Design a binder for this molecule. Structure first.
Ligand code: ACO
Ligand code: PAR
Ligand code: CA
Ligand code: CA
Length: 177
């Protein structure tokens, strides 16, 4: 059915810890097999706020099915998005909790939901994402969700395929009119 997003709370941290240690997630996220204390210290919504990151839980049929986050690119940690000048740019990262639910279009639905959420903030001008060049499945998911590959950028987490979706693009693709 429909994928929706809710803010993540401190009550979700134990569940997130479990997720972040699932093998299909470890492959792409972290580098990193975080301990419970790691997840508690780093993903606490108030702590994430210090790097302009907002955490979400993705929901499907009343069940938590994934984690996502958005961030203000201009507000990111040292080394991150240092050429950015537009405070309207938001980036996203996300994961699906269940190995059995990968590759079935659920991630595309999640990304679409997150993109819509973000453009409902009228200050937001463009959404970006930075999948690993190795992560072809994530790249194709973002493409299906309306992102376009720009090129390769150097990040603190290595080279990334920089992908964007502008507000004008989102407007244009809302209808075939
Ligand atoms: C910036 C970031 O957050 S980067 C990545 C983040 N997180 C992760 O990788 C965690 C582990 N993976 C996941 O959570 C999920 O796979 C997600 C969220 C990345 C993607 O969601 P999914 O539901 O798996 O993707 P979805 O099924 O919507 O689309 C994936 C597409 O990739 C395609 N694909 C998979 N592998 C490849 C490949 N090697 N080459 C080309 N295409 C591929 C699939 O065929 C599908 O495209 P299609 O509809 O044209 O057939
Ligand atoms: N990883 C250790 C911790 O990272 C924290 O940083 C938090 C975020 O700022 C950081 O997220 C960065 C984001 O900042 C940056 N602007 C974009 C980058 N892709 C994100 O990276 C995140 O998502 C990708 C998936 O796309 C994962 O592969 C990666 O391991 C994960 N950290 O990941 C952490 C969870 O959101 C703090 N710097 C600190 O507590 C500590 O260094
Ligand atoms: Ca405002
Ligand atoms: Ca149109």
């Amino acid at each position: 059915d429909s994928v929706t997003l809710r803010l993540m709370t401190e009550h979700d941290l134990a569940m997130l810890y479990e997720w972040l240690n699932r093998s299909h997630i470890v492959e792409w996220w972290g580098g990193a097999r975080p301990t419970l204390a790691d997840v508690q210290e780093q993903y606490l919504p108030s702590v994430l706020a210090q790097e302009s990151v907002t955490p979400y839980i993705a929901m499907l049929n009343g069940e938590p099915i994934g984690y996502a986050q958005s961030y203000v690119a201009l507000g990111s940690g040292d080394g991150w998005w240092e050429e950015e000048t537009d405070p309207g740019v938001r980036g996203i990262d996300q994961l699906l909790a269940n190995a059995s639910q990968l590759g079935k279009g659920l991630g595309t639905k999640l990304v679409r939901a997150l993109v819509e959420l973000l453009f409902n903030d009228p200050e937001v001008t463009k959404i970006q994402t930075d999948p690993s060049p190795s992560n072809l499945r994530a790249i194709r998911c973002y493409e299906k969700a309306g992102f376009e590959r720009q090129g390769t950028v150097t990040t603190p987490d290595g080279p990334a395929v920089y992908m964007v979706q502008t507000r004008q693009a989102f407007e244009r693709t809302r209808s075939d009119a």
